[PDB]
Amino acid sequence: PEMVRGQVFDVGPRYTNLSYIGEGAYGMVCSAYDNVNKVRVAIKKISPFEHQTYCQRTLREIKILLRFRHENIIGINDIIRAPTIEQMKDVYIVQDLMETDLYKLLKTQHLSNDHICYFLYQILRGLKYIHSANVLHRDLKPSNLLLNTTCDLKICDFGLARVADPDHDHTGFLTEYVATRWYRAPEIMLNSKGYTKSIDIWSVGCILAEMLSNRPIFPGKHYLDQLNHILGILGSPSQEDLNCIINLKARNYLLSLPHKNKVPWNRLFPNADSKALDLLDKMLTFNPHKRIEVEQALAHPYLEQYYDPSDEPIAEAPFPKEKLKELIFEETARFQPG
Ligand SMILES: [NH3+]CC1CCN(c2ncnc3[nH]ccc23)CC1
Numbered sequence: 001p002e003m004v005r006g007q008v009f010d011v012g013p014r015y016t017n018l019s020y021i022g023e024g025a026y027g028m029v030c031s032a033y034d035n036v037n038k039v040r041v042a043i044k045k046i047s048p049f050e051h052q053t054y055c056q057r058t059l060r061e062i063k064i065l066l067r068f069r070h071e072n073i074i075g076i077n078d079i080i081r082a083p084t085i086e087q088m089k090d091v092y093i094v095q096d097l098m099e100t101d102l103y104k105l106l107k108t109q110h111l112s113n114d115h116i117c118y119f120l121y122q123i124l125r126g127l128k129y130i131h132s133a134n135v136l137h138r139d140l141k142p143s144n145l146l147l148n149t150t151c152d153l154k155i156c157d158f159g160l161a162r163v164a165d166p167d168h169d170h171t172g173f174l175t176e177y178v179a180t181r182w183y184r185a186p187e188i189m190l191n192s193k194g195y196t197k198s199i200d201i202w203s204v205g206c207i208l209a210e211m212l213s214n215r216p217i218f219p220g221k222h223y224l225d226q227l228n229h230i231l232g233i234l235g236s237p238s239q240e241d242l243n244c245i246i247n248l249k250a251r252n253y254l255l256s257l258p259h260k261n262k263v264p265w266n267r268l269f270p271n272a273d274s275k276a277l278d279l280l281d282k283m284l285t286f287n288p289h290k291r292i293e294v295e296q297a298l299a300h301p302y303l304e305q306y307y308d309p310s311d312e313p314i315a316e317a318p319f320p321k322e323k324l325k326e327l328i329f330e331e332t333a334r335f336q337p338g
Helices: 052-067 102-108 113-132 186-190 198-213 223-234 239-243 248-256 274-283 294-298 321-331
Strands: 015-023 028-034 039-046 078-080 091-096 145-147 153-155
Touching: 015 039, 052 321, 102 145, 102 198, 113 145, 113 153, 113 198, 113 274, 113 294, 186 198, 186 223, 186 248, 198 274, 198 294, 239 248, 274 294
Parallel strands: none
Antiparallel strands: 015 028, 028 039, 039 091, 078 091, 145 153
C-alpha cells in the first residue's frame, strides 16, 4: 500500500511514482505514472461512504462523467476500488493530468484577448454538450476549469449537477443554495432553485468578466451581499424585469432599494474587446428569460473565428446511503479485471 502524507493512497501496481497535488472534495489528489498508457495521470481519492451527501455527489458525478464523452469535459479513464462491497472503503478516480486550472492562472497570469476568446469558446462548447444532455452543471467557476500546457480546457466537478427542471424552478425569497457564491445568478437569491440552463450562463458571464480583469466581478461576502454586488453593476432592474418576480417578499425587497444606475462595461473593462463586452452584457442579463443561451453565445461575433456548429457536438441522448454504496459499486464495476 503506497503512502503520501502518511495516508493510504492505494492505486498500484498500475499507478506508481506518486506526488501530492492537493486536497479535493472528500479526499486527496495525486499525480502518478500510469504503467499501461505510459503517461502521468491525476488520481483523486474519494472516501464518501459514511454520509448521504458525499455518496450522492460521488455517484451523480460518476454517472455523468462515464456517460459524457467530449473534448472539453474531463473524462474518467479508470476507477480503482476493492473487489467486494464489504472491502470497499475508498474509490480512486483516474483522470487526464491537467497542468493548471483557470483559478490558478487568473491569480498569476495576464490573459491576452486571444487566450480569453479561446478559453470562452471551449467553455461554451463543453456547456453546449452538457445542456444538450438536459444536465445543468450548477457550479461553474474558474477552479472547475482545468487547462493543460497547450491551453486545452476541460470542465470538471459534476458533484452539484442536476437534470434541468424549469417547471419546478420557483421558490421564495432568500432560499438557501449550495453552489459557489460569487458565480450565483441574481434570481437564486430572489425566486429560483437553479433548475434552468440560464443558471450556468450567468456563471460563465462571471468567468468571462474575471478573465478580463483577473478579479471576480461580484465578490459578495455573504448570501444577500451577493445581490448587493450584482445590482451595483447592472443597476436597478427595469419595471418589466421586476414584474417577472411575482413573489412579494422578493419584489418588495427590490423596490425598497435606492435607484442604482448601470455601470458601463467599457468603463469597468477599458482594455476589453468591444465584442467580448457585448457578449458579456448578454450573459449577465438580470432577467433569466432574456439571458443569452449557450448556442446563441457560440454564434456571437466575438467567437466568429472559432464558431463551427458541426464541430460543436451534442449528447446522443438526454439524461439511503447503503443502497448508494451498492450503486457506486455497480457503476464502477466496468473497470474491474473482468
Ligand atoms: N479544482 C481544481 C483541482 C486541481 C487539482 N486536481 C487535478 N489536478 C490535475 N489534473 C487533474 N485532472 C483531474 C483533476 C485534476 C483536481 C481539481
